[PDB]
Design an enzyme around this catalytic site. Structure first.
Site, PDB file in Angstrom:
ATOM      1  N   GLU A 793       0.869  -1.168   0.000  1.00 17.55           N
ATOM      2  CA  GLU A 793       0.000   0.000   0.000  1.00 17.55           C
ATOM      3  C   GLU A 793       0.905   1.216   0.000  1.00 17.55           C
ATOM      4  OE1 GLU A 793      -3.692  -0.674  -0.182  1.00 17.55           O
ATOM      5  OE2 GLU A 793      -2.265  -2.084  -1.081  1.00 17.55           O
ATOM      6  N   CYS A 827      -0.666   9.783   3.532  1.00 20.09           N
ATOM      7  CA  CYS A 827      -0.641   9.269   2.172  1.00 20.09           C
ATOM      8  C   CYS A 827      -1.839   9.765   1.380  1.00 20.09           C
ATOM      9  CB  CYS A 827      -0.619   7.747   2.205  1.00 20.09           C
ATOM     10  SG  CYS A 827      -1.942   7.001   3.199  1.00 20.09           S
TER      11      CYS A 827
HETATM   12  N1  LIG Z   1      -1.341   3.561   0.780  1.00 14.21           N
HETATM   13  C1  LIG Z   1      -1.359   3.778   2.182  1.00 14.21           C
HETATM   14  O1  LIG Z   1      -2.294   3.380   2.856  1.00 14.21           O
HETATM   15  C2  LIG Z   1      -0.245   4.517   2.821  1.00 14.21           C
HETATM   16  C3  LIG Z   1      -0.355   4.852   4.190  1.00 14.21           C
HETATM   17  C4  LIG Z   1       0.633   5.601   4.854  1.00 14.21           C
HETATM   18  C5  LIG Z   1       1.759   5.962   4.146  1.00 14.21           C
HETATM   19  N2  LIG Z   1       1.894   5.595   2.794  1.00 14.21           N
HETATM   20  C6  LIG Z   1       3.086   5.988   2.123  1.00 14.21           C
HETATM   21  O2  LIG Z   1       4.158   5.749   2.996  1.00 14.21           O
HETATM   22  C7  LIG Z   1       5.137   6.702   2.686  1.00 14.21           C
HETATM   23  C8  LIG Z   1       5.686   7.368   3.935  1.00 14.21           C
HETATM   24  O3  LIG Z   1       6.085   6.435   4.902  1.00 14.21           O
HETATM   25  P1  LIG Z   1       7.630   6.116   5.107  1.00 14.21           P
HETATM   26  O4  LIG Z   1       8.403   7.372   4.862  1.00 14.21           O
HETATM   27  O5  LIG Z   1       7.847   5.486   6.453  1.00 14.21           O
HETATM   28  O6  LIG Z   1       7.933   5.106   3.904  1.00 14.21           O
HETATM   29  P2  LIG Z   1       9.153   4.323   3.476  1.00 14.21           P
HETATM   30  O7  LIG Z   1       8.941   3.637   2.113  1.00 14.21           O
HETATM   31  O8  LIG Z   1      10.227   5.297   3.619  1.00 14.21           O
HETATM   32  O9  LIG Z   1       9.395   3.401   4.621  1.00 14.21           O
HETATM   33  C9  LIG Z   1       8.412   2.451   4.959  1.00 14.21           C
HETATM   34  C10 LIG Z   1       8.975   1.219   5.658  1.00 14.21           C
HETATM   35  O10 LIG Z   1       9.731   0.407   4.778  1.00 14.21           O
HETATM   36  C11 LIG Z   1      10.973   0.208   5.421  1.00 14.21           C
HETATM   37  N3  LIG Z   1      11.988   0.050   4.409  1.00 14.21           N
HETATM   38  C12 LIG Z   1      12.777   1.008   3.807  1.00 14.21           C
HETATM   39  N4  LIG Z   1      13.550   0.429   2.888  1.00 14.21           N
HETATM   40  C13 LIG Z   1      13.280  -0.931   2.851  1.00 14.21           C
HETATM   41  C14 LIG Z   1      13.756  -2.003   2.124  1.00 14.21           C
HETATM   42  N5  LIG Z   1      14.772  -1.800   1.135  1.00 14.21           N
HETATM   43  N6  LIG Z   1      13.258  -3.225   2.347  1.00 14.21           N
HETATM   44  C15 LIG Z   1      12.293  -3.465   3.272  1.00 14.21           C
HETATM   45  N7  LIG Z   1      11.802  -2.435   4.013  1.00 14.21           N
HETATM   46  C16 LIG Z   1      12.277  -1.193   3.814  1.00 14.21           C
HETATM   47  C17 LIG Z   1      11.191   1.343   6.339  1.00 14.21           C
HETATM   48  O11 LIG Z   1      12.105   1.031   7.334  1.00 14.21           O
HETATM   49  C18 LIG Z   1       9.827   1.518   6.859  1.00 14.21           C
HETATM   50  O12 LIG Z   1       9.540   0.653   7.896  1.00 14.21           O
HETATM   51  C19 LIG Z   1       4.527   7.699   1.754  1.00 14.21           C
HETATM   52  O13 LIG Z   1       4.939   7.471   0.465  1.00 14.21           O
HETATM   53  C20 LIG Z   1       3.087   7.451   1.897  1.00 14.21           C
HETATM   54  O14 LIG Z   1       2.310   7.851   0.812  1.00 14.21           O
HETATM   55  C21 LIG Z   1       0.890   4.873   2.106  1.00 14.21           C
END
Ligand SMILES: NC(=O)c1ccc[n+]([C@@H]2O[C@H](COP(=O)([O-])OP(=O)(O)OC[C@H]3O[C@@H](n4cnc5c(N)ncnc54)[C@H](O)[C@@H]3O)[C@@H](O)[C@H]2O)c1
Ligand SMILES: Cc1cc2nc3c(=O)[nH]c(=O)nc-3n(C[C@H](O)[C@H](O)[C@H](O)COP(=O)(O)OP(=O)(O)OC[C@H]3O[C@@H](n4cnc5c(N)ncnc54)[C@H](O)[C@@H]3O)c2cc1C
Ligand SMILES: OCc1ccc2occc2c1
Ligand SMILES: [Mg+2]
Lengths: 1216, 107, 54
Positions: A793, A827
């Site tokens: 997501e 998001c």
């Molecule tokens: N569609 C939805 O419901 C929804 C909800 C909330 C946030 N978001 C999205 O989330 C983003 C913001 O959150 P964020 O900054 O924490 O996102 P992110 O992609 O930076 O990080 C998310 C998670 O993934 C982990 N991560 C980072 N690199 C990884 C890898 N190579 N392998 C596995 N895990 C990894 C991070 O440690 C963290 O726990 C925004 O883009 C937002 O739009 C989407």
């Protein structure tokens, strides 16, 4: 550094005993409010009989003299829609200033058809208001195509004469009935007639709900100029005989709220004082109108200061409204009467029932509060009114009671309660201009009851009066309203003169809540208990929260790698408040990649023991966790506020969402999961920082309740609240082996994803990271040789389209909230506002004005609207985007930030005006709103442009026009749609949340398909079926039979029936909103078949779910699809270069394990969206009719429609 | 048009009136794509005619008619099917296409 | 109105001329009455000076 929460929400003043008694009644149970009101409202039998006789006499006079619109409808045999359309046309014609020009247009152009050619703005923008006028019924949106047809029909049938009559009627109504006059001078001239009969006036310049400083200044100068005109005309008549003015505090400041109380006292109060000083000099009344319930107590702080201000001494014209529909009313009156005694000011107290009833019900439900701040049975308000009149009538030496009512029963009860001793100045009645005169002409004057009545007289232009005319019409037009009932022939006089006091007294339970209005906790009935919020306008709540928040900041918050074997050692660092790096919130010990791999192995070993916990008991763990989170909410708020940069309001919503996820997935489990829905195994839950408790809890709760042990990897920015959530889940009974917390960065997430025993991945985060995870998993197959399920997501590029029918103030509020709440770090946040060209300048000006009223700072103060961005890296990324846009010449508006922000990482809310939607590349996760303009004829192209980003998360539309709603919602491709409201704060099980394209794989979190992705055999979700069969599927089934593929044709027919494509449900939720959930096709599905039978099964699955397909041309199966019916051929393409023929919305793969692995790698390499891939062997296709699950071949769409947007709730008009 | 229905009388006059209840909030999506195509090629008058046809078309009307209890009597407007277009000029063809597409038809 | 008042006589003619039963003759006359009243009402709802006859 200021201590955390040391200045969270200090009250304007220490709360006196009388003030505390008010706050204590705010949401008092209705059964406790009524008995003392019944007692206070009780009168002798002699008085009750006299009151009934007086009321009957008044009602007989009213009914014996009782039409303009009705006479027009009758004369020209108009249908209701024709009447509405005619009034809309008349309204538009009256926007032509010159009379001769208007009459020429009517005679020469309008009357000869072709009205559309001569009249950017729909004629029908205000048709909901005219609908109320014509039909008495409120419809939230306008069927503009029906109205256009009706207008053409009536003009072609009746010509100029009907247009003339409509114009004259609208001119009279808008110039003389809905307002006393267009300007204060006209209103004063027209007041002489009834003043000579003994009426008085209070003028309403119709200002309300200032959005900008400039609005507030305009309303101020309108009030000031009106006071001069009224005072000049009063000419020394004084405050009782002479006219006065009414003001709304919300008109005088754009941030009139308890959260901004310091600005209210510092900035709004002096403005009221200046107006009051002028009213004092002319010796006229100045009344403060009462508004929403959350402004009542704040307004008392202004009333207190004004009444104690010596500069206003000598003048008794200060007036204040109290709303008898409010549970605090008698306690407010006690406070006011005491204030009048202390100050020596004879406060003019206008007792009203109240104008915001529907909105108060909706608000309390939305906010999950304990109870309503208003009564829920109309008769309770009536008793409250009479009880409060008894209190006022005992205090006429110190207050001047003003009984505003159109209800002849209420009037008669008070007339007799007040008794025979009367003098002007003792008390008066009040009524609304153009509504109450028929009643009060039976009251005023020595030949009647010889009691005075003050006419509340709206003054303003057509534009001004139409803005909130719906609310004013509902006051006397709902089925429970006296003025509606007086005009109802089926309502007898005996019914109208029924004594509410005696009726309530005789009820089996005195003061019972309305049976048809749900308390907020009961919105979902037996399914689950709604989460509860907190009332940040309640001083008791603010005082208790202040202490709990301070206490939370004194806690030694930690997050550790909580393996099944116990806490693990690792690299430890502090967690700093993003709003002030000097504020250390806690410490996190991060997980080594070795311990992450060890945790997966421990989860794998623990998987059978957790799967063996019955689903009902797993669900009971979730429900216990929800209870614990609810009880711990204040402490959780404080941690979220300090760790994640959230305001208190946003932290409340965050905790509520977590509670709702727990209870929703618990209930969905109890509805579905049985022995045959085996868990996947260890699930890696990777969550984002920005909803650090809600999404974290949601993913984990879902995986756990589905019977999977969980490796929980929270975002590196926000491990503390995640550790607390895990602690709560463990306390609720989730075994340590079933829920392991692994703090750390993306390396820990990647190590978990890559671990051999990982059976599924639930990811919420950026699209770019999801793509890395997708690539990692493409190497992997389960022990059964099938792809590892990934729920991913991801980001949004969310747009809102606003047309010229939308109300600018409503748009701006929803835009400011959607774009800048949480500093745009949702998001769902609004990224691109699209304004129809004809209204773009006005809305943009209002938007910029509203932007500058936001308070940005460290979020441990209630007055802070926008907190920090999470890290300096996020700040740098956002600022780089802003400067790129600024470097391209785009207009950039930014709030100036206070010096105190320097200790944290803040980005000012920013508005960037773009030329084209293509100016944006990727999601900018920060407080940056982009604005584009569009011409109305290009609306469909604009929707294409929005879709063209490839995202598809949230989408908003502000319009009153059904044709535009139908067009836009049918063409937009996004998972969460919002009509006439903000596009954020989706509610679990009400707006199941999640998008498509670059925004998600689905299924939606908080929706009914979610748990089914976390088991090996998906259950049938509640309500999940459809009676509709895709017609291309049916054509394909017949084609298969014609080809001799009899078993496949049967499988195709079965898929047609089993598909839930076309499911269309309304989900239970708050009043004043319709929340819809529908299943559509995903789009184009990539088919990678291996055999002819496999291809036929894949095609049947895809077609049954409404999709088109691209079939892998390298399969060599072209000869298997010869002579397709044209309907099927239109849905079928062959693809030699999959990357060239996307984006796809899913994939079906047939092959052995190594073929599946190879295809999965090729699919992962496709540009753009992550594809939900389903794979099966040829033998599995033969053995299992559900080899490809149809749940994952449809797309869920949630739509939330604000049905109160027109100004009232039509359904609640029937609830009295 | 059907006897005993609201389109009938309009066939018996030289300019048909707008029948009672005859409208639809739905716009044919192919009509919409056609209007954008006309826009792109500068056929401004025809694009306007296309948009106007899309709006005035009652395709998708779906009404319940008053009648006896214990029965639901429904009345709906669908596409005719495939319309034969016999144009003479390019503009005429664009206008014919607009009319046919706005009413859900193929040609 | 005239067909309604004369329905019994009209029934007799329809029964004997067209082979209809009494119930179907009633339905026949009722339908004629309904066409008359329906087209009258539809006219009152729609027709104006610009809707010229053929
Ligand atoms: N569609 C939805 O419901 C929804 C909800 C909330 C946030 N978001 C999205 O989330 C983003 C913001 O959150 P964020 O900054 O924490 O996102 P992110 O992609 O930076 O990080 C998310 C998670 O993934 C982990 N991560 C980072 N690199 C990884 C890898 N190579 N392998 C596995 N895990 C990894 C991070 O440690 C963290 O726990 C925004 O883009 C937002 O739009 C989407
Ligand atoms: C001159 C004047 C000034 C006013 N100023 C204000 C003001 O500043 N602020 C304000 O909020 N109102 C104000 N009002 C009142 C409001 O605008 C309505 O006019 C008033 O509430 C209608 O009450 P009633 O006695 O006229 O009608 P009634 O029909 O006897 O009562 C209608 C009222 O009952 C209440 N009601 C309806 N349904 C329910 C229910 N299910 N449960 C509980 N209560 C219910 C509502 O208050 C509704 O308005 C004013 C009214 C007048 C006449
Ligand atoms: O319609 C009368 C009226 C007068 C003042 C008001 O203030 C807030 C609502 C309201 C209604
Ligand atoms: Mg990141």
């Amino acid at each position: 550094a200021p201590a955390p929460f040391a200045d969270f929400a200090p009250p304007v003043r220490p709360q006196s005993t009388l003030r505390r008694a008010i706050t204590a009644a705010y949401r008092r149970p209705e059964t406790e409010c009524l008995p003392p009101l019944v007692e206070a409202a009780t009168q002798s039998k002699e008085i009750r009989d006299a009151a009934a006789s007086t009321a009957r006499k008044l009602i007989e006079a009213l009914r014996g003299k009782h039409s303009g619109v009705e006479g027009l409808v009758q004369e020209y045999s108009l249908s209701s829609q024709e009447g509405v359309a005619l009034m809309c046309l008349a309204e538009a014609l009256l926007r032509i200033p010159d009379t001769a020009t208007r009459d020429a247009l009517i005679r020469d152009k309008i009357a000869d058809g072709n009205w559309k050619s001569h009249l950017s703005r729909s004629l029908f923008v205000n048709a909901a208001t005219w609908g109320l006028v014509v039909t008495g019924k409120l419809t939230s949106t306008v069927n503009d195509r029906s109205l256009a047809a009706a207008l053409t029909r009536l003009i072609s049938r009746c010509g100029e004469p009907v247009i003339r009559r409509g114009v004259d009627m609208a001119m009279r109504m808008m110039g003389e009935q809905f307002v006393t006059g267009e300007t204060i001078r006209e209103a004063l001239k027209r007041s002489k007639e009834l003043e000579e009969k003994g009426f008085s006036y209070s003028y309403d310049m119709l200002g309300e709900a200032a959005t900008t400083a400039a609005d507030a200044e305009r309303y101020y100068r309108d009030y000031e100029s009106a006071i001069h005109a009224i005072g000049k005309a009063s000419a020394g008549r004084g405050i009782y005989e002479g006219p006065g003015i009414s003001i709304k505090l919300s008109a005088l400041h754009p941030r009139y709220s308890r959260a901004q109380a310091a600005r209210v006292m510092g900035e709004l109060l002096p403005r009221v004082k200046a107006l009051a000083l002028l009213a004092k000099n002319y010796d006229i009344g100045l009344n403060i109108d009462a508004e929403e319930a959350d402004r009542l107590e704040l307004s008392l702080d202004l009333l207190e200061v004004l009444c104690l201000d010596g500069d206003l001494s000598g003048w008794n014209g200060m007036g204040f409204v109290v709303q008898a529909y409010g549970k605090r009313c008698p306690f407010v009156l006690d406070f006011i009467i005491d204030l009048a005694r202390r100050s020596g000011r004879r406060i003019m107290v206008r007792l009203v029932k109240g104008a915001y009833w529907d909105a108060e019900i909706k608000r309390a439900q939305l906010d999950g509060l304990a109870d309503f701040p208003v009564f829920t049975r109309k008769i309770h308000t009536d008793v409250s009114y009479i009880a409060c009149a008894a209190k006022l009538l005992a205090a006429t030496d110190v207050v001047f009671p003003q009984f505003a009512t159109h209800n002849a029963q209420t009037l008669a009860a008070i007339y007799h309660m007040a008794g025979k001793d009367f003098h002007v100045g003792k008390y008066e009645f009040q009524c609304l201009h153009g509504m109450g005169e028929p009643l009060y002409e039976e009251v005023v004057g020595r030949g009647k009851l010889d009691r005075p009545c003050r006419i509340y007289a709206p003054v303003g232009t057509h534009e001004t009066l139409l803005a909130y005319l719906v609310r004013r019409l509902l006051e006397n037009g709902a089925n429970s309203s006296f003025v509606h009932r007086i005009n109802d022939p089926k309502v007898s006089i005996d019914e109208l003169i029924a004594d509410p006091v005696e009726v309530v007294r005789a009820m089996p339970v005195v003061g019972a809540k309305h049976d048809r209005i749900a308390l907020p906790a009961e919105l979902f009935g037996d399914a689950r208990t709604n989460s509860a919020g907190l009332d940040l306008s309640n001083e008791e709540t603010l005082a208790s929260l202040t202490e709990a928040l301070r206490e939370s900041a004194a806690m030694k918050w930690t997050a550790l790698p909580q393996l099944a074997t116990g806490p693990a050692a690792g690299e430890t660092r502090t967690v700093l408040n993003p709003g002030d790096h000097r504020d250390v919130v806690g410490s996190v010990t991060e997980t080594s990649e070795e311990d992450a791999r060890r945790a997966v192995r421990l989860a794998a070993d623990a998987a059978p023991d957790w799967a063996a916990v019955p689903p009902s008991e797993r669900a009971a763990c979730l429900d216990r966790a929800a209870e614990l989170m609810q009880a711990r909410m204040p402490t959780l708020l404080g941690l979220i506020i300090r760790e994640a940069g959230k305001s208190a309001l946003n932290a409340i919503a965050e905790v509520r969402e977590a509670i709702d996820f727990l209870r929703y997935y618990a209930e969905q489990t109890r509805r579905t999961l049985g022995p045959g829905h085996g868990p996947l195994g260890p699930i890696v839950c990777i969550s984002p920082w920005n909803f650090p408790l809600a999404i974290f809890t949601g993913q984990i709760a879902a995986a756990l309740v589905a019977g999977n042990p969980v490796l929980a990897k929270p975002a590196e920015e926000t491990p503390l609240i995640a550790a607390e959530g895990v602690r709560i889940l463990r306390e609720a009974g989730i075994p340590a082996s079933a829920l392991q917390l692994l703090p750390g960065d993306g390396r820990v997430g990647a190590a978990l994803v890559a671990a051999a025993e990982t059976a599924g991945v639930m990811f919420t985060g950026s699209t770019e990271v999801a793509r890395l995870i997708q690539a990692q998993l493409a190497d992997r197959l389960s022990p059964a040789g099938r792809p590892i399920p990934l729920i991913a997501e991801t980001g949004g590029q969310n747009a809102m389209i606003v047309d010229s029918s939308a109300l600018a103030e409503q748009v701006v509020g929803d835009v400011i909230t959607s774009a800048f709440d949480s500093a745009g770090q949702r998001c769902s946040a609004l990224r691109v506002l699209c304004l129809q060209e004809d209204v773009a300048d006005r809305i943009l000006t209002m938007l910029k004005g509203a932007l500058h009223e936001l308070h940005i700072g460290r979020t441990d103060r209630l007055s802070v609207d926008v907190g920090p961005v999470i890290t300096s890296e996020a700040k740098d990324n956002i600022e780089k985007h802003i400067e790129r846009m600024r470097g391209l010449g785009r207009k950039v508006e930014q709030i100036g930030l206070a010096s105190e922000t320097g200790v944290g990482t803040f980005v000012p809310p920013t508005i960037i005006e773009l030329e084209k939607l293509s100016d944006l590349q990727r999601e900018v996760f920060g407080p940056v709103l982009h604005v584009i303009r569009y011409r109305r004829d290009d609306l469909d192209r604009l929707v294409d442009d929005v879709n063209a980003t490839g995202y598809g998360l949230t989408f908003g539309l502000h319009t009153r026009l059904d044709e535009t709603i139908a067009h836009v919602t049918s063409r937009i491709k996004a998972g969460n749609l919002y009509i006439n409201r903000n596009i954020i704060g989706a509610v679990v099980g009400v707006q199941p949340f999640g998008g498509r394209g670059l925004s998600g794989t689905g299924p939606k979190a908080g929706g009914p398909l979610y748990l089914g992705r976390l088991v090996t055999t998906a259950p049938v979700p509640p309500q999940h079926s459809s009676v509709h069969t895709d017609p291309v599927l049916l054509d394909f089934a017949k084609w298969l039979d014609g080809k001799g593929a009899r078993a496949e044709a049967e499988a195709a027919r079965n898929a047609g029936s089993s598909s839930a494509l076309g499911l269309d449900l309304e989900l239970p939720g708050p009043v004043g909103e319709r929340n819809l959930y529908t299943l559509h096709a995903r789009g184009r599905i990539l088919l990678v078949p291996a055999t002819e039978s496999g291809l036929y099964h894949q095609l049947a699955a895809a077609l049954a779910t409404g999709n088109s397909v691209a079939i892998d041309a390298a399969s060599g199966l072209q000869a298997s699809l010869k002579n397709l019916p044209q309907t099927v051929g239109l849905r079928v393409s062959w693809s030699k270069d999959w990357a060239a023929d996307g984006p796809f919305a899913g994939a079906l793969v047939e092959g052995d394990a190594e073929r599946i692995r190879a295809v999965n790698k090729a699919i992962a390499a496709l540009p753009g969206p992550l594809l939900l891939v389903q794979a099966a062997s040829s033998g599995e296709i033969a053995r299992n009719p559900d080899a490809y699950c149809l749940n994952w071949l449809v797309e869920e769409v949630s739509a939330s429609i604000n049905t109160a947007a027109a100004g009232g709730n039509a359904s609640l008009m029937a609830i009295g």
